[PDB]
């Protein structure tokens, strides 16, 4: 039941970079929302 | 801002002062009531008779005049609440 297989792996890290949004909330409210911008643009629309 | 000091005096340090003022919160309200006979004659003419039309227009003018009086009362409540808060803030002149 053992065979070598050719797999398509990652080779580097992912990235996560703040925006100005998350920087200001981290400064003033001690906190971070992940996906604050994608979150906000879908906040008021139908597809929440 | 500081001032440069002359001979034999310690120059003072860069004084930085941070304060925070909160918000007082204060509601106001006005009630007015309508009688049940006024509510009955406000919403329908039972038969289309002359007396019933008179009472329908009286009920309508009652509702309208009470709405205008209540809106005026909210304006004057804003007046009085703001004067209340300025008097609670204001220290008198000899102290000032």
């Amino acid at each position: 039941y053992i065979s070598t297989q050719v797999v398509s792996a990652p080779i580097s890290y992912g990235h996560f970079i703040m925006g100005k949004e998350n920087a200001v909330t981290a400064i003033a409210y001690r906190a971070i929302m992940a996906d604050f911008t994608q979150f906000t643009v879908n906040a008021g629309t139908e597809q929440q | 801002p500081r001032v440069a000091t002359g001979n034999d005096v310690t120059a003072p340090k860069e004084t930085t002062i941070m304060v925070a003022k909160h918000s007082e919160k204060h509601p106001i309200n006005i009630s007015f009531d309508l009688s049940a006979a006024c509510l009955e004659h406000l919403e329908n003419t039972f038969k289309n008779t002359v007396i019933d039309q008179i009472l329908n227009i009286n009920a309508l003018h009652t509702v309208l005049r009470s709405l205008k009086n209540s809106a005026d009362s909210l304006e004057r409540g804003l007046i009085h609440a703001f004067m209340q808060t300025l008097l609670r803030k204001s220290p008198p002149q000899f102290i000032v």
Binding site: - | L42, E43, I57, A59, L60, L64, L67, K68, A71
Partner: protein
């Protein structure tokens, strides 16, 4: 059938029935004279056929309401007073469960240390100098909307679910875990139980001591519940049979039961209150349709 469509039709029918109860169609001639604010108010024209709960505004000196200005939802008691200036005065269930005898000494002292001041001491002296309890102080309803000004404004619910406004955060009755007990063979039999308040007196050789009990049972019938409470209280009933003759104080019974209202079985949850750090175990009933029946005494 379609199913989804009929479901939307029923939901639209319920929303339109709520609007039919809420607003009123106007058959005034409705001429174009008025300003737009009066125009939109004459188009809407609310009436109070929407809340369907019955409340009462109440003024009480704020020295008496020590945990109850913070913890919304409490039983309240009307104490009439021979003072003309305030003819009635309002009382917390915990404020009266202080000198109730059911409460153990640790909980009693702990609550008292909440309730220690001059006003509350004088009122407890008045309550003790009263002869009986049940018709000098009385049941009044369930707490919502504490204001806490100078003289604190308390709303209080006579009938219906407990809420101020917006029909949000529907509060619940808070009963001290020690004072309540459920006499039935199967506790929490099938479904929603009726919550009662039982006042039971007792005589320790000198004076009468009252006890404040809260029972939860599946029985609706008051004859059935006093028949289960006699079986529960048959010993002390016997002691009062000896007391009530040699006494001369104007009372004629052992205790009395009165219905608060409905509850739900799954809406019973435990917890604790805390005021000034005193952790205090309670059984928090969650959603209560308040329904005061008459007092029914048993001897």
């Amino acid at each position: 059938m379609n199913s989804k469509s009929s479901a939307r039709a029923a939901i639209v029918d319920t929303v339109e029935a709520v609007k039919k109860r809420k607003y009123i169609s106007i058959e005034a001639g409705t001429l174009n004279n008025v300003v737009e604010k009066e125009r939109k108010f004459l188009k809407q024209f609310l009436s109070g056929r929407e809340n369907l709960r019955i409340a009462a505004r109440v003024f009480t000196p704020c020295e008496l309401l020590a945990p109850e200005l913070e913890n919304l939802g409490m039983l309240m008691y009307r104490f009439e007073t021979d003072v003309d200036n305030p003819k009635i005065l309002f009382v917390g269930l915990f404020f009266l469960c202080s000198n109730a005898f059911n409460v153990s000494a640790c909980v009693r002292t702990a609550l008292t240390t909440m309730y220690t001041n001059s006003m509350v001491d004088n009122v407890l002296s008045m309550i003790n100098t009263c002869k009986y309890l049940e018709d000098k102080v009385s049941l009044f309803g369930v707490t919502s909307l504490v204001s806490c000004g100078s003289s604190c404004l308390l709303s209080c619910v006579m009938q219906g679910n407990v809420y101020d406004a917006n029909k949000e955060n529907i509060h619940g009755l808070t009963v001290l875990k020690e004072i309540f007990l459920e006499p039935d063979w199967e506790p929490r039999q099938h479904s929603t139980q009726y919550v009662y308040v039982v006042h039971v007196y007792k005589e320790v050789l000198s004076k009468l001591q009252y006890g404040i009990y809260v029972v939860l049972t599946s029985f609706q019938n008051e004859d059935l519940v006093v028949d289960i409470l006699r079986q529960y209280f048959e010993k002390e009933r016997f002691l009062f049979l000896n007391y009530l003759i040699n006494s001369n104080t104007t009372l004629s019974y052992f205790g009395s039961v009165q219905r608060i209202g409905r509850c739900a079985t799954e809406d019973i949850k435990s917890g604790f209150l805390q005021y000034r750090g005193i952790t205090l175990p309670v059984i928090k009933l969650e959603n209560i349709f308040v329904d005061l029946s008459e007092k029914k005494v048993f001897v």
